[PDB]
A paper describes a structure:
The metabotropic glutamate receptors (mGlus) play critical roles in modulating synaptic transmission and neuronal excitability, and dimerization is mandatory for these receptors to exert their functions. In addition to homodimers, these class C G protein-coupled receptors (GPCRs) were shown to form heterodimers as well. Here we report twelve cryo-electron microscopy (cryo-EM) structures of the mGlu2–mGlu3 and mGlu2–mGlu4 heterodimers in different conformational states, including inactive, intermediate inactive, intermediate active and fully active conformations. The Venus flytrap domains undergo a sequential conformational change, while the transmembrane domains exhibit a substantial rearrangement from an inactive, symmetric dimer with diverse dimerization patterns to an active, asymmetric dimer in a conserved dimerization mode.
For mGlu2–mGlu4, the Gi1-bound complex was prepared by using ADX88178, an mGlu4-selective PAM,28 together with glutamate and JNJ-40411813, leading to determination of the Gi1-bound mGlu2–mGlu4 structure (2.9 Å at the ECDs; 3.4 Å at the TMDs and Gi1) and a G protein-free structure of the heterodimer (overall 2.9 Å). In contrast to the conformational deviation of the VFTs in the inactive structures, the agonist-bound VFTs exhibit an identical closed conformation in both the G protein-bound and -free structures of the mGlu2–mGlu3 and mGlu2–mGlu4 heterodimers, which resembles the VFT conformation observed in the agonist-bound structures previously determined for their parent homodimers. In the absence of G protein, the agonist-bound heterodimers display an asymmetric dimer interface in the extracellular regions of the TMDs. For mGlu2–mGlu4, the mGlu4 subunit rotates anticlockwise by ~20° (extracellular view) with its helix VI forming extensive interactions with helices I, VI, and VII of mGlu2. The asymmetric dimerization patterns in the G protein-free, agonist-bound structures of the heterodimers, of which the dimer association is mediated by helix VI in one subunit and helices I, VI, and VII in the other subunit, are similar to those observed in the previously determined Gi-bound structures of the mGlu2 and mGlu4 homodimers, where helix VI in the Gi-bound subunit and helices I, VI, and VII of the Gi-free subunit mediate dimerization. For the mGlu2–mGlu4 heterodimer, the dimerization mode in the G protein-free state suggests that mGlu4 is the subunit that transduces signals. This is supported by the previous study reporting that the group III subunits are responsible for G protein activation in the heterodimers between the group II and III mGlus, and was further confirmed by our functional data showing that the mGlu2-blocked heterodimer (mGlu2X–mGlu4) was activated by glutamate at a similar level to that of the wild-type heterodimer while no response was observed for the mGlu2–mGlu4X heterodimer.
Numbering used by the authors:
A (entry chain 2): 23 to 110, 135 to 592, 602 to 655, 678 to 750, 758 to 820
B (entry chain 4): 41 to 127, 149 to 374, 385 to 483, 487 to 508, 513 to 682, 694 to 776, 780 to 848
Amino acid sequence: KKVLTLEGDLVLGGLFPVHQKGGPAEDCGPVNEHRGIQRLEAMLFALDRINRDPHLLPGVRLGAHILDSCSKDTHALEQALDFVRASLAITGVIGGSYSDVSIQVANLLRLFQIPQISYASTSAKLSDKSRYDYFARTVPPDFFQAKAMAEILRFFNWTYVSTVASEGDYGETGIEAFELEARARNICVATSEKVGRAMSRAAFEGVVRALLQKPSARVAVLFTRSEDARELLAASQRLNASFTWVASDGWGALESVVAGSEGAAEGAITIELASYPISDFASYFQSLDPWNNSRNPWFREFWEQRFRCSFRQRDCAAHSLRAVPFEQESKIMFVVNAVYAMAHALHNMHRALCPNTTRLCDAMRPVNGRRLYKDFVLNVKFDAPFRPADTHNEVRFDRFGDGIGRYNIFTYLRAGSGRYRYQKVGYWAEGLTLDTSLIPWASPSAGPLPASRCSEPCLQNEVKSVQPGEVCCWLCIPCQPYEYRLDEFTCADCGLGYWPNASLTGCFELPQEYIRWGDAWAVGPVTIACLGALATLFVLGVFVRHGRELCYILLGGVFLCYCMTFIFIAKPSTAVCTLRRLGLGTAFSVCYSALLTKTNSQVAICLALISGQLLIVVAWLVVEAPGTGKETAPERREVVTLRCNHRDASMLGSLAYNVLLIALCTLYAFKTREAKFIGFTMYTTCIIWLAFLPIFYVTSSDYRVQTTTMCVSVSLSGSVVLGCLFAPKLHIILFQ
Amino acid sequence: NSIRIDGDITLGGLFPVHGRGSEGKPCGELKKEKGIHRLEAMLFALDRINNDPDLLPNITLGARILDTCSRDTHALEQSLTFVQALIRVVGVIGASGSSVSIMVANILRLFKIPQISYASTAPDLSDNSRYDFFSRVVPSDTYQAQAMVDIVRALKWNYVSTVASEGSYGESGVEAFIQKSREDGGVCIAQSVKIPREPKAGEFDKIIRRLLETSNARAVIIFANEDDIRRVLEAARRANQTGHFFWMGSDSWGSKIAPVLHLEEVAEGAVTILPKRMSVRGFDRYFSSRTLDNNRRNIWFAEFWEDNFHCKLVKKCTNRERIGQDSAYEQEGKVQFVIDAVYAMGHALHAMHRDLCPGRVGLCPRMDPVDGTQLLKYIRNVNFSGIAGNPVTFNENGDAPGRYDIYQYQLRAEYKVIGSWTDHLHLRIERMHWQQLPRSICSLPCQPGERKKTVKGMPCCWHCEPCTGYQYQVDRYTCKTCPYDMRPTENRTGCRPIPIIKLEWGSPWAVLPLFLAVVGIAATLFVVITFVRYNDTPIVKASGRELSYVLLAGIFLCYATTFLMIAEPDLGTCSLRRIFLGLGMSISYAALLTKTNRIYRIFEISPASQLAITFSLISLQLLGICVWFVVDPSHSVVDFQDQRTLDPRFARGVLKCDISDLSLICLLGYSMLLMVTCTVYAIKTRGTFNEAKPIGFTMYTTCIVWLAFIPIFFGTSQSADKLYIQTTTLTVSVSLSASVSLGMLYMPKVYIILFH
Ligand SMILES: *[C@@H]1O[C@H](CO)[C@@H](O)[C@H](O)[C@H]1NC(C)=O
Ligand SMILES: *[C@@H]1O[C@H](CO)[C@@H](O)[C@H](O)[C@H]1NC(C)=O
Ligand SMILES: *[C@@H]1O[C@H](CO)[C@@H](O)[C@H](O)[C@H]1NC(C)=O
Ligand SMILES: N[C@@H](CCC(=O)O)C(=O)O
Ligand SMILES: N[C@@H](CCC(=O)O)C(=O)O
């Protein structure tokens, strides 16, 4: 346990993590390049500039009592005892890089009223002034960081996400803060596992495998320390698992975390505190040699580890820090700001308690911890030292002693040839300002974005949601074909006669398929009906060339029977349905009535009787609603059939009754006995009518054949009349 | 403000005498049981060790007992007195709260001071790397968490909620139980509620609504401290939720009367756990015999008098009151563990004294600077028996063996033992009384057979979804389709045989062919018998004596054909159906064609040639029949409407006969082709009278009856039924044609001979 002691009137403590934590045998092992050495040298440089600064403590010199925490809370607490040895002197300590280390040291420092200013600890529970009333920090808490990455996740539509955190006072409170923030943003959590402080590589592999237990999640947030993040990346590479990471300031832009794990870190988004490099610190650090810098006791180990050599072998003088590239650690600015804030507090307290002399007066030899704390909580407002060219950064302390929630967003690239650098692609100044153009996996020419969701989306119109009553992880259950997806929560219906197609919200598709004139079953009678009309036209033509009244009526009577057959096949309408009932009844009656006239002024009487049939037909049709109607099937798989009315009504029966009476009237001519010829027509007419009844009876359904056979009966009925009452007559004039 | 006792060896002490203060006040309300009873246990134990000749002879033990004040930060500044002189106490009795002990542990270990806690149950303090100088006499929460989930399993509910407070005990308690629940798999947490250590106004009212949101999780598990449980129970009374919640208290609420004081109606039947313990009869006598005069060593005892007796030194206080009768007295459950912790440190000192100072009776010179490193190894190696005979021992990590027992709060208002935990549960449900056997489960089971089991995000909630009347439930996980010839059982689990619909007499349509067949057979039997009876030479000359007989037999075969059409469907008979209709139709048509041709030929032996032509026409029909006989000797057809089964399962049974549409058309077409020849011959002949008139009528009847066959037979497709309609219409069509043809010729022959 080496000590860094600097002579001075009053000394400042230091708690930098110079050495990384070791195994069970050793308290702490290797020295870290950036987090331990660079920050310690930054504090030493800041102390050097303060001593020679005439405007800041010109008459009193500032010392140092920096100790190594070895990245452990117990060792840091022993060094805190080393701090409080004088009090049981140390006016203040500039240390506490780790949050658990900061809390452990502040717990002891509260008893002795020793103020503490931290440069890297961002734990949200350190803002509790009741528990830590002597603690301050130049960095913001983790609540703003959780808000920032919640906004980042919302930007990339990242809902179903996995949470990885390291146990302690930093990863934990961070993970609950992040989950609390993401709950309000409708962000789900797949798994929540913790990283132990003393865990082996097999345990890291187990954690990585547990991450893979949910293929649904693709992105994992990291609240682990640098060593834990590095081990997790190594385990992910070993298992050949490709992941995208959204890490906290623990990872940041540290190259040691991605050392040897460049493949598994591709596309990882890491945010870090917004800081600027110090031009003077780079020159100060690059001009350091192990012989010249005897002030630092740990510099020899740094030289041995960085430039691989041995002091005993005497092969370390060849290397130099100027030749090798130098990269400033991000939190150097925060260390400098903390040291300068403590120095400014001391200067203000000396200017308000020792106004006469310039050196440390006798009224301040015991330094009051409470007075000093209330002197740098309020009286610290000055331009940040070593601002690059024109920035307006100032060191400020709020009522909680925290900093400003200003963050920078980075991502890990390839940069063509192997360089594997970090590139800033946004910032969080109380608002997300991502730049997707600089991220080489979010460009439109890179394919679909890496998606981490729980429930796969689905086209609303074809398949509807289920609303499981949860925040996410829903299901897609399609609605039945007679349901329109009017709303995402539940589908609706267009109503009877409308098919929910096209837009699927307002549909209004109604099919109106008809029997058509070219039906397979109707192909027969349409040719027969046309043939009968053609035969009637030939019979009508010779009549004009030649009982005159009886023959003309009969020829005309056969004409409209075939004419109405073409009306039925084509299409039904409002006027068609009305004429269909009246025409069919009248034509059958007039043909039989005209035949009765041949059996027996007389023409006027039979037409007058026929006129009475029309009056009865109108009365029957009036009570039958002769208007057309597109009747809908009981179920949906059919369409409207355009049925005028029920065919089982008395409209057909009443017409047949008059026809039967007229047919029975012609039967009287058989008793009188072309008397033989007419009797044959009635006998055939009754049989063909009697043969139609079984056809209509069995075919209750399939209305197409019902209209087809109806046309068949009327078509051949006229042919029988014209083939038995006029064909023998034509034989004596044409054939003979 | 602390208790100071002079002695050769000083023992530290930390007790929560006062409750946690509200707002900025460090100390709140006095704790009469958690703070006073436990503190007096140390005083009672020290006065008993100092009077025991066999334990530390001639060596007195002092005490420096401080006030924890139930605050983690407040105990740290008090503990500074134990180590201020170092940069003297050899060890301390650890605090009650797990969080309080942690800061004391990492500070006393920092000064090599062993610590033994009597009530600190936390897996965090079990780590030997950070708390190697810390020891405990009670089991850790890891064993308690395993015990809690065992009680949950045995009580037949697996959907519960977790309630915890801020600190290293409540947060690590629910986390340990959740981790053990994940290994179980059958138990899930609906939600987790974390009570802040500095709640605002109405905070406890808000968390009740959080548990009230999920009404399914009627049983909740609470890991809160004594003060929080009292406020949580009070908030339940505000929401009128008494009896709705089933509480699962931790070791912080095992048998304490403070969280249930004035709240007997609420939290009835709450199941509580606590490490195995027995009541100490020596402490009860010691405590009950304390007054304001004899007990002046305890500074807080004067304050305890007002709180216990509800007086002041309000109503005035008389200095003659007794604890055991003027107020309710029941010693704290952890009093025994305080005795064990004091005796364990005293036993180790005696064990270290006999080795370090063998000759000396008091403190030898090489023992006055006691070092914690040497004292600690003697702390872990004590195997004595404490009061009530319980064996106390420390493991390598300084922990105690896992021992637990289960209480239940019942009203008849006391805790009753209902079980125990000794690495396995020994619950006694028959004594548990709360609602009979309350259950807190998600998605209550459904098993009518049709209802499938769907797994939601939480494995506890089994979503319920029926299976339609088309598939069978092979298992509760998924239901699968029945075979197409199988109809699902009444319950969807498994399938059942599909019925059938055979053709038998008694049907509305099948009745007519049977009646006509009887009439047709009788009519054709009478005429053939009449000709055989008296065979007149003029009538037989026109008949031919060979053509008429086969026509009657051929027509009679059609009447026999319809008999087997409706007969029992069999593979032999159904295959022979085409033979019956084919032979009957061909015989009637062929002989009729020959008769028409012979009459036409003479108009514009002879009967011997006519029958040869008819036989030749029969031969070609038979030759074609033989081709159709072997082309597909199909047995029968089963599925008629079952081929395209209906959506419901009301009725799909159908019984058909092996028949082909092409075969039926070809068989009918051959007969119709012969009838077409008769149509042409009859038309030309229509221009002998006894032959033209009947023949013209026969072709007239066949054409019309066949003309109605096409739309009925072809139009029955996609109707209600096809096999039932088709067979009936086919039988009547051939029967009517045979009856009309035979009747038209037989009747004039019988009538002519009647008048002759
Ligand atoms: C998903 O992200 C894209 C940008 O990549 C954005 O345009 C879109 O709106 C996001 N999704 C939703 C539902 O807002
Ligand atoms: C650092 O030490 C080297 C010798 O090791 C010396 O040459 C050099 O001048 C020193 N740098 C200084 C004094 O700035
Ligand atoms: C204590 O003694 C008993 C009796 O010999 C036996 O359990 C063992 O020796 C010791 N027990 C433990 C747990 O060390
Ligand atoms: N800032 C993190 C890590 C410290 C560091 O950046 O080194 C913490 O609060 O502990
Ligand atoms: N066992 C609990 C509370 C014990 C008690 O009632 O004091 C803890 O470790 O915090």
